[PDB]
């Protein structure tokens, strides 16, 4: 009949087209459709991107020379790889990609159905699936369902590690390899000790986790915590102190989750930049610290082969050219890489003793595989241009390389930042809307006009 | 068992493209929703079946 | 000569797609032929 | 590479990852068709 005959306009909803998804706040059926359809987009990308990666994948080049971020995630789970991270079978990558892609059709189907065909609101259809954002008990119930789902997800990682082939362990004795985890770390003093570690240098908070036993045991704890917390919220309603402290509205809840995801995004940025245990350098390339350490190692090896006594070699500043002390005395690599002495990696640790780098082991025990690894990592440092010219900013064109660690750290810093902006946006708006002045100041009742002047 | 697999996957791709356009059009279309509903059922069932056929036939090529 | 017979949303969609194609061609050219570094 | 049986579908696999971007663009085609009401 008329252009404005539906409720999908500013005239009916109060929201302009550019805020059109706000028209869904109290339309649980269509909002369900939007959410399920969006989950389809996430799953779609995971499937399609994996098949793209696999179609472009040359198994004899390192993954990190090929712009891959998803196959490294699958390989870290122990699928498709053997000793040293060599690709022994691409079919697991194919399976993950296909199954995600197929599943995204199901999610998209349900999303499109609920978005334009199914009931627009669910409350008349079902008291179980219907909800009011202001119903605090219903909100904690749905929260609890999803906590249980998340806890199960954490236990799937545990099951993979302990019962279905293990995980890729860059630290495995004798060289990186897939390894079944049989003794996950359950001692809460260790597990929650990570949570109380300083985030600063040499400590690194949870980003410092450096063995798969702690990783797997941590996911046992998180799984049980989430399942217990989910049961708790299904069986309880918010306490008085919580009721009085929070805003209780759809937009407020969205803002809490935006703040949470922002924080997680920043954490992920630091994880992929510094951690080489759950982001194995075999798949993701060396970390920044790692490649800087590997350069010092490379020229220590070269110059020592030429006859240099690298322990007694004084550099131009008076500090050792190759070896010096950290501020607490440990023997570390010299030059600018003095800043990176907290680095730890499987190619370097055989040279480390109780007091730091061991001059005797350096003189006598460096193996060719260590020279190879240090050279490889020195020349795949995570530096490169936006158009994927590998090297320092003054490099000439030649090498097509930007490390997966740079791509993953930068993308998630950008995303985490805007999600913090979104947290502030929606948190401020939710406060103003609950108090009734999100549309502006009431001309007939302007608060400041009833306040005493400041002076 | 043969390389008939290439057909079933082609059928799956074609059927998918047909559903991708037809399903939203049908869901938002006023008339002929009775006829559309049965077609969406049939297309969906054939789609699921082709996924299974390709998945099984995968292991013969 | 009467306006509206070609809907503006179709004009905008087709025009935008044309912009995307032509700019996409220019980005392709950054990797092939002159200016590709190769 | 994909398993050789699927190789003929290589050009389609090359294009699929971009489809999510098209969904964001489709929202604007749709909104233009309803006059951004």
């Amino acid at each position: 009949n008329s252009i404005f005959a539906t409720n999908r306009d500013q005239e009916s909803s109060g929201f302009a087209w550019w805020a059109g998804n706000a028209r869904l706040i109290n339309l649980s059926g269509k909002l369900l459709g939007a959410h399920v359809a969006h989950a389809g987009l996430i799953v779609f990308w995971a499937g399609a991107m994996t098949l793209f990666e696999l179609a472009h994948f040359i198994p004899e080049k390192p993954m990190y020379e090929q712009g891959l971020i998803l196959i490294p995630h699958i390989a870290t789970l122990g699928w498709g790889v053997g000793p040293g991270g060599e690709v022994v079978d691409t079919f697991p990558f194919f399976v993950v990609g296909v199954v995600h892609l197929i599943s995204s059709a199901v999610l998209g189907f349900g999303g499109v159905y609920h978005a334009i065909r199914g009931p627009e609101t669910l409350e008349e259809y079902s008291s179980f699936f219907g909800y009011d954002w202001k119903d605090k008990n219903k909100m904690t119930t749905i929260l609890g369902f999803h906590l249980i789902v998340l806890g199960i997800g954490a236990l799937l990682l545990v099951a993979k590690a302990m019962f279905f082939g293990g995980l890729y362990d860059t630290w495995a004795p004798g060289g990186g390899d897939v390894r079944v985890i049989t003794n996950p770390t359950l001692d809460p003093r260790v597990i929650f000790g990570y949570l109380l570690k300083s985030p600063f240098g040499g400590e690194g908070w949870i980003v410092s986790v450096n063995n798969l036993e702690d990783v797997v045991g941590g996911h046992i704890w998180i799984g049980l915590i989430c399942i217990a917390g989910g049961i708790w919220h299904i069986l309880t309603t918010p306490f008085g102190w919580a009721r009085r402290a929070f805003i209780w509205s759809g937009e407020a809840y969205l803002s809490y989750s935006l703040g949470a995801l922002s924080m997680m995004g920043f954490i992920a940025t630091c994880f992929v930049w510094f951690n080489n245990t759950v982001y194995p350098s075999e798949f993701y390339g060396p970390t920044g610290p790692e490649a800087s350490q590997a350069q010092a190692m490379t020229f220590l090896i070269r110059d020592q082969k030429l006859g240099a006594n690298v322990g007694s070699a004084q550099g131009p500043t008076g500090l050792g050219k190759y070896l010096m002390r950290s501020p607490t005395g440990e023997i570390i690599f010299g030059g600018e890489t003095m800043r990176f002495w907290d680095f730890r990696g499987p190619w370097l640790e055989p040279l480390r003793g109780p007091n730091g780098l061991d001059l005797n082991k350096i003189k006598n025990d460096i193996q060719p595989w260590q020279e190879r690894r240090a050279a490889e990592y020195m020349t795949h440092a995570p530096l490169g241009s936006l158009n994927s010219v590998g090297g320092v900013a003054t490099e000439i064109n030649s090498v097509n390389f930007v490390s997966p660690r740079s791509w993953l750290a930068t993308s998630h810093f950008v995303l985490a930042f805007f999600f913090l902006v979104g947290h502030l946006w929606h948190a401020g708006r939710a406060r103003a809307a609950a108090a009734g002045f999100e549309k502006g100041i009431d001309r007939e009742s302007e608060p400041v006009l009833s306040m005493p002047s400041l002076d | 068992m043969t390389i008939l697999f290439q057909l079933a996957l082609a059928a799956l791709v074609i059927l998918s493209f047909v559903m991708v356009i037809g399903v939203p059009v049908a869901y938002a279309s006023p008339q002929d929703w009775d006829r559309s509903k049965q077609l969406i059922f049939l297309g969906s069932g054939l789609w699921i079946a082709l996924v299974l056929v390709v998945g099984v036939l995968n292991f013969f090529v | 000569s009467e306006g509206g017979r070609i809907p503006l949303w179709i004009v905008a969609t087709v025009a935008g797609m044309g912009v995307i194609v032509i700019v996409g061609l220019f980005f392709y050219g950054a990797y092939a032929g002159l200016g590709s570094s190769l | 590479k994909l398993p050789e049986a699927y190789a003929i579908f290589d050009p389609l696999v090359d294009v699929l990852p971009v489809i999510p971007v098209l969904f964001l663009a489709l929202a604007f085609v749709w909104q233009a068709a309803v006059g951004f009401r």
Binding site: - | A28, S29 | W9 | L12, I19, L22, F23, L26, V29
Partner: peptide
């Protein structure tokens, strides 16, 4: 195959606006 890749993204790219157009013609629930 640049011709194949371009044809694929053409039919995929046309599918979206085609849905909107078909519904506009059918005076559907846009």
């Amino acid at each position: 195959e640049v011709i194949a890749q371009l044809t694929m993204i053409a039919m995929i790219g046309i599918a979206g606006p085609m849905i909107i157009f078909l519904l506009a013609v059918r005076r559907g629930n846009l």
